[PDB]
């Protein structure tokens, strides 16, 4: 029942929904943050080519460099998810 809230996105609207969907399947399958992050990272490397990086958690800030149109930062329920492509 995890509510998706997109906080900042430089990414087509299709991929934003795809990102939320893939994160949804990751939370359905895994409970530990690194495992959720690896699931999203690997599926995006496959569906959208390398190189993606994913961070999952409830308390963190970041500063990253990313190809344009390949950045999303959203909440799925209480969990925050940063997904982006650099390289």
């Amino acid at each position: 029942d995890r509510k998706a809230v997109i906080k900042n996105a430089d990414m087509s609207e299709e991929m934003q929904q795809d990102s939320v969907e893939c994160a949804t399947q990751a939370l359905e399958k895994y409970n530990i943050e690194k495992d959720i992050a690896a699931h999203i990272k690997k599926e995006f490397d496959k569906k959208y080519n390398p190189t993606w990086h994913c961070i999952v958690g409830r308390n963190f800030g970041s500063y990253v460099t990313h190809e344009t149109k390949h950045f999303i930062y959203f909440y799925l329920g209480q969990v925050a998810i940063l997904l982006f492509k650099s390289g």
């Binding site: 409830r58 308390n59 800030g61 970041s62 460099t65 190809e67 344009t68």
Partner: peptide, 12 residues
Amino acid sequence: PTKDSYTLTEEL
């Protein structure tokens, strides 16, 4: 073509 971005979580 790259670009720099911040993120921060909600306060808890």
